[PDB]
Amino acid sequence: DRINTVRGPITISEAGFTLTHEHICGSSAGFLRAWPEFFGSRAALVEKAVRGLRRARAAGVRTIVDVSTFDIGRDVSLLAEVSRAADVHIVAATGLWEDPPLSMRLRSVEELTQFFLREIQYGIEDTGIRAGIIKVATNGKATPFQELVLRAAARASLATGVPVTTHTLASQRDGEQQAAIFESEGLSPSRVCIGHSDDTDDLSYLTALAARGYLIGLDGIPHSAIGLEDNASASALLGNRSWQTRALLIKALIDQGYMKQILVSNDWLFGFSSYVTNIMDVMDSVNPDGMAFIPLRVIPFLREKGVSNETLAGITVTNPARFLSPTLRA
Amino acid sequence: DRINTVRGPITISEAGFTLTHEHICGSSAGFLRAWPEFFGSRAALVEKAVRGLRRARAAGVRTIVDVSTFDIGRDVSLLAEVSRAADVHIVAATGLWEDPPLSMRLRSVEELTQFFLREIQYGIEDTGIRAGIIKVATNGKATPFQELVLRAAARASLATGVPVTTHTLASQRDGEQQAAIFESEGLSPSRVCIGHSDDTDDLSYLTALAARGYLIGLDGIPHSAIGLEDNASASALLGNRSWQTRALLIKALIDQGYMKQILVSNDWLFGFSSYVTNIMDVMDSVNPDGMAFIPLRVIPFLREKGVSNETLAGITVTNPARFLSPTLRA
Numbered sequence: 069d070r071i072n073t074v075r076g077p078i079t080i081s082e083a084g085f086t087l088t089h090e091h092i093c094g095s096s097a098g099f100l101r102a103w104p105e106f107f108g109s110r111a112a113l114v115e116k117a118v119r120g121l122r123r124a125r126a127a128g129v130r131t132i133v134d135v136s137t138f139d140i141g142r143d144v145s146l147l148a149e150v151s152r153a154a155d156v157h158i159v160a161a162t163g164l165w166e167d168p169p170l171s172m173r174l175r176s177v178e179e180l181t182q183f184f185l186r187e188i189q190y191g192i193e194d195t196g197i198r199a200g201i202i203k204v205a206t207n208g209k210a211t212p213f214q215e216l217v218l219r220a221a222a223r224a225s226l227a228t229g230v231p232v233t234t235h236t237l238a239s240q241r242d243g244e245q246q247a248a249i250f251e252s253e254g255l256s257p258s259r260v261c262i263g264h265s266d267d268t269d270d271l272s273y274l275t276a277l278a279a280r281g282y283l284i285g286l287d288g289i290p291h292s293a294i295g296l297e298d299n300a301s302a303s304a305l306l307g308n309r310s311w312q313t314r315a316l317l318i319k320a321l322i323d324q325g326y327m328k329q330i331l332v333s334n335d336w337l338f339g340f341s342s343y344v345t346n347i348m349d350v351m352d353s354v355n356p357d358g359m360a361f362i363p364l365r366v367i368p369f370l371r372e373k374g375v376s377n378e379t380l381a382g383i384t385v386t387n388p389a390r391f392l393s394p395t396l397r398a
Numbered sequence: 399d400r401i402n403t404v405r406g407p408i409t410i411s412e413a414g415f416t417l418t419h420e421h422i423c424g425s426s427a428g429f430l431r432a433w434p435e436f437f438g439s440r441a442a443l444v445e446k447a448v449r450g451l452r453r454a455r456a457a458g459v460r461t462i463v464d465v466s467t468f469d470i471g472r473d474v475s476l477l478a479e480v481s482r483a484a485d486v487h488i489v490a491a492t493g494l495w496e497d498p499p500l501s502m503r504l505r506s507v508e509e510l511t512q513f514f515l516r517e518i519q520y521g522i523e524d525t526g527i528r529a530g531i532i533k534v535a536t537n538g539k540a541t542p543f544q545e546l547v548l549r550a551a552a553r554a555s556l557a558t559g560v561p562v563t564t565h566t567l568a569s570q571r572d573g574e575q576q577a578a579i580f581e582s583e584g585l586s587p588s589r590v591c592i593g594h595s596d597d598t599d600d601l602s603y604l605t606a607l608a609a610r611g612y613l614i615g616l617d618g619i620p621h622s623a624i625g626l627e628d629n630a631s632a633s634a635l636l637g638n639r640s641w642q643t644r645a646l647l648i649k650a651l652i653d654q655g656y657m658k659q660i661l662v663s664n665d666w667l668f669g670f671s672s673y674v675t676n677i678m679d680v681m682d683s684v685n686p687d688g689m690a691f692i693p694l695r696v697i698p699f700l701r702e703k704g705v706s707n708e709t710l711a712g713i714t715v716t717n718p719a720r721f722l723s724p725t726l727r728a
């Protein structure tokens with residue numbers, strides 16, 4: 069009946085329109101503290117994030133789930149500052165992404181479970197802010213350590229009811245192996261979102277996940293390098309499929325009976341240090357709406373394609389609330 | 399005429415007996431903040447470090463160089479606390495070790511130079527504490543990013559006079575490639591210590607470095623897994639050569655005319671999270687003297703083998719002061 073945010077517990081009704089996969093800043097552990105000038109300044113990053121979240125709020129967004137883990141350089145004090153200034157709830161994450169340092173990579177499944185439970189049940193470092201979601205990652209076949217991370221995420225979710233959300237290399241159908249590992253630990257698919265699923269057009273893969281009960285994260289809708297002439301790094305990151313192609317996967321899954329299992333987001337950021345320099349400028353030129361892209365551009369697009377207002381409100385309000393509200397079976 | 403420590407500038411005379419390659423805690427960026435229970439508690443780690451440094455001080459140590467970089471999880475506030483409580487000077491490091499995160503690995507040589515200069519000239523994150531040494535690393539042939547790190551370290555040293563110290567895989571003769579890269583940037587070998595050089599018995603490699611003017615870091619004297627029955631992880635980390643074999647390399651280089659180029663240390667730690675769990679307990683059982691091993695065991699051993707007190711005072715007092723005092727040519 070309560071979801072943990074960076075400003076404390078909120079009721080399910082208070083979450084409202086929720087973007088389920090976003091980042092204030094995509095970075096690395098300790099990086100913002102040690103080199104704030106990379107972002108201009110910490111204050112410039114804060115100001116940019118507050119302006120972006122205020123524009124998202126004006127477009128109807130009420131909550132974002134920041135799926136930055138320890139190794140994305142999640143700074144919950146930064147999230148709290150931006151959340152207060154913008155009047156947008158922010159749910160923080162535990163888990164591990166694709167860049168864990170040695171002190172994480174050498175840990176056992178039991179040790180990792182203790183760490184994820186610390187961040188859900190006690191607090192993130194000394195802040196008392198508790199995570200409301202567990203983020204994990206693979207890029208193709210899981211490494212041995214990533215198998216431990218997936219298992220520890222399942223154990224933390226089974227103890228607390230907090231859901232799991234994943235990064236995939238969708239072209240390698242990673243959700244299949246992720247699901248197998250989660251289910252081997254006894255985790256309900258209703259507690260799991262297989263993310264970056266809009267990176268693929270393979271309906272057999274997407275429906276195989278949805279048929280088992282997984283939530284499907286169509287979370288990078290504005291990610292596209294179409295019309296970026298000869299930018300190899302942006303093309304590799306964003307892909308060559310249009311935002312319309314990605315958005316039509318929302319309609320595709322609705323038409324197959326999976327409206328209650330779709331989660332939609334932008335996978336946007338206000339700073340981004342874990343990729344090439346100036347990538348944030350390139351991304352902002354592609355999508356000047358930032359996190360407001362979903363309500364301002366995707367929702368009207370889907371309405372014109374015949375999707376109802378009621379169905380889209382279910383996807384953007386009802387589904388995130390059911391996903392985020394702690395439970396063992398949703 | 400001044401060396402930066404975690405408590406401010408000290409004179410060259412104040413450095414005294416100096417251990418040139420040590421760690422308060424071998425960790426990862428942000429790890430101690432996010433999971434202090436891994437070490438029991440932060441307070442337990444502090445107490446262990448203070449007791450260890452007090453025993454080292456009683457044995458004659460006056461300064462240690464903590465060569466923990468950003469990616470070793472260097473916490474300069476922790477170093478300052480331990481330094482004040484133990485009455486032992488601590489020099490902090492900038493640079494990058496073998497575990498840089500994506501936000502570092504994607505940077506250019508110019509960006510890395512700015513970061514190293516920030517930590518030498520301005521301060522480490524918001525503390526105002528300035529680094530007195532630059533630490534870099536290879537493990538075999540340098541990766542493309544490690545080549546950039548080595549070049550940026552050379553540029554930072556050329557601008558400031560602060561020396562460079564290295565991690566090597568000594569069996570692969572890494573010092574040869576490190577030297578070639580440093581010299582391509584114009585760095586004087588007198589500003590560089592090639593570390594972990596006691597990991598090898600190859601006198602042709604060691605004398606080739608010393609003949610060019612490099613300082614030779616015989617920095618892991620107590621590291622040995624001899625007498626550890628069937629501990630594969632400790633054997634892989636510590637090696638099967640005795641501490642006496644390592645210590646005799648000090649005499650070997652003295653006998654070849656290189657007494658002024660030898661730097662000696664323990665490469666000890668009080669916490670260690672970047673390796674297998676409980677490694678600190680294994681290491682403490684091998685060497686209960688910790689950082690006091692050099693003065694309590696190595697110095698008397700070398701005296702019995704015929705090395706003079708004057709020569710050993712030159713190695714432990716004069717050489718570190720010449721190395722650490724900022725200059726372009728020492």
Ligand SMILES: CCC1(C)CCCCC1
Nearest residue numbers: 322375376377378379380
């Ligand atoms: C029948 C699928 C549906 C028209 C339901 C109402 C929202 C839009 C999709």
Ligand SMILES: CCC1(C)CCCCC1
Nearest residue numbers: 652705706707708709710
């Ligand atoms: C001649 C080498 C030397 C005996 C000099 C004094 C210190 C010990 C070594």
Ligand SMILES: OC1(O)C=CCC=C1
Nearest residue numbers: 091094140235335337
């Ligand atoms: O994996 C990601 O969602 C994280 C940050 C950026 C881009 C992609």
Ligand SMILES: OC1(O)C=CCC=C1
Nearest residue numbers: 421424470565665667
């Ligand atoms: O490379 C090292 O010196 C760092 C920490 C530990 C062990 C070795």
Ligand SMILES: [Zn+2]
Nearest residue numbers: 234235236264
């Ligand atoms: Zn991702």
Ligand SMILES: [Zn+2]
Nearest residue numbers: 090091135335
């Ligand atoms: Zn993301």
Ligand SMILES: [Zn+2]
Nearest residue numbers: 564565566594
């Ligand atoms: Zn090393």
Ligand SMILES: [Zn+2]
Nearest residue numbers: 420421465665
């Ligand atoms: Zn070391």
